[PDB]
Scaffold this active site. Sequence first.
Site, mmCIF file in Angstrom:
data_model
loop_
_atom_site.group_PDB
_atom_site.id
_atom_site.type_symbol
_atom_site.label_atom_id
_atom_site.label_comp_id
_atom_site.label_asym_id
_atom_site.label_seq_id
_atom_site.Cartn_x
_atom_site.Cartn_y
_atom_site.Cartn_z
ATOM 1 N N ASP A 32 -4.669 -0.727 1.514
ATOM 2 C CA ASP A 32 -5.377 0.049 0.389
ATOM 3 C C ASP A 32 -6.786 0.678 1.500
ATOM 4 O O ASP A 32 -7.883 0.515 1.161
ATOM 5 C CB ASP A 32 -6.259 -1.142 -0.499
ATOM 6 N N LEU A 43 -23.304 -4.271 -7.401
ATOM 7 C CA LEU A 43 -22.464 -3.242 -7.163
ATOM 8 C C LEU A 43 -20.914 -3.621 -7.727
ATOM 9 O O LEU A 43 -20.527 -4.666 -7.999
ATOM 10 C CB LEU A 43 -22.397 -3.298 -5.581
ATOM 11 N N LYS A 48 -20.494 -12.220 -2.604
ATOM 12 C CA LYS A 48 -19.391 -12.088 -3.307
ATOM 13 C C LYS A 48 -19.581 -13.483 -3.984
ATOM 14 O O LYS A 48 -19.500 -14.568 -3.280
ATOM 15 C CB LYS A 48 -18.091 -11.815 -2.852
ATOM 16 N N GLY A 92 -14.668 -4.107 -6.904
ATOM 17 C CA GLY A 92 -13.228 -3.783 -6.643
ATOM 18 C C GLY A 92 -12.386 -4.771 -7.037
ATOM 19 O O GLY A 92 -11.152 -5.091 -6.296
ATOM 20 N N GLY A 93 -12.711 -5.525 -8.266
ATOM 21 C CA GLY A 93 -11.856 -6.595 -8.793
ATOM 22 C C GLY A 93 -12.674 -7.945 -9.464
ATOM 23 O O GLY A 93 -13.961 -7.390 -9.875
ATOM 24 N N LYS A 134 -18.051 -11.202 -8.381
ATOM 25 C CA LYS A 134 -19.386 -10.254 -8.639
ATOM 26 C C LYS A 134 -19.756 -10.076 -7.191
ATOM 27 O O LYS A 134 -19.855 -11.042 -6.423
ATOM 28 C CB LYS A 134 -20.237 -11.376 -9.337
#
Length: 286
Positions: free
Chosen positions: A133, A18, A40, A21-22, A25
């Site tokens: 954010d 997926l 992650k 956002g940076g 992984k």
Amino acid sequence: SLNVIKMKSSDFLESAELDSGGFGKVSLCFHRTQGLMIMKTVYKGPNCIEHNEALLEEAKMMNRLRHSRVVKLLGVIIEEGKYSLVMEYMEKGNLMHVLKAEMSTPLSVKGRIILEIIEGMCYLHGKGVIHKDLKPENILVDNDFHIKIADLGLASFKMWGTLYYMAPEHLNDVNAKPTEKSDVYSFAVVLWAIFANKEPYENAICEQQLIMCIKSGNRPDVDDITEYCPREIISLMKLCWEANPEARPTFPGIEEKFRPFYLSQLEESVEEDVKSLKKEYSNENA
Ligand SMILES: CC(C)(C)c1cc(NC(=O)Nc2ccc(-c3cccc4c(N)nccc34)cc2)no1
Ligand SMILES: [Mg+2]
């Protein structure tokens, strides 16, 4: 206080990667016995020491902020020093993904989602955590249509925001420091997206125009909402994106205004509405 999970590579497989956002992984994984989960992890490379460092801090932060409206860290996997975050999978994806589906989300459920975001933000703010954010991509949704707040990029930001959701004061200065009122601004746009079922500002021609426009007072188009949206939510949306952050309420302020409106107007029909969504998904898809 970090839960170290004993789980080998042989226990699960990556079903899908997926967008993370940076630097991370992010993977949807399947465990042999425990089912779907989110991991992650760090990529191999020259930056693995600072990323791994960032991941650990991410894990500590998620752990000390355990709460029913914050994304759930199930634990950490440590394999030869390398961390992986394991998290409970929110099966319906992010909020924009739910909003853009063919099945309309009913008013009362939208009401509850909003109420749950407010609860999440009161908690974070009460803990001294500015989110920085808040946007629909950071609002994850489960099979019962309850939500939890994530912060996909905040581990990337601390190691070192999204245009449509950013308070005007932070388009102005790259050295402006986010505050609680910056999150309130973002929340106003999230409110609009919830009823517009889409991202704002589709007609913007270019970034520099958009920035100048918003700083001068332009906001998402209230007239471009085509569903019924209660006067109270429109009123709150406009209060939360006031130009002067001192004019914006706090999140406890928002809870004080909103929860009585939810409890008297919307809460009654939620359980029934969730029941028919659950049916109009497992029949219209499966
Ligand atoms: C406490 C505070 C909010 C400030 C915070 C959060 C944070 N870290 C994260 O939020 N990490 C993170 C959260 C979610 C996911 C993820 C991505 C795609 C899909 C997911 C899905 N379907 N379910 C579940 C999770 C998903 C990936 C990483 N660091 O501080
Ligand atoms: Mg495997």
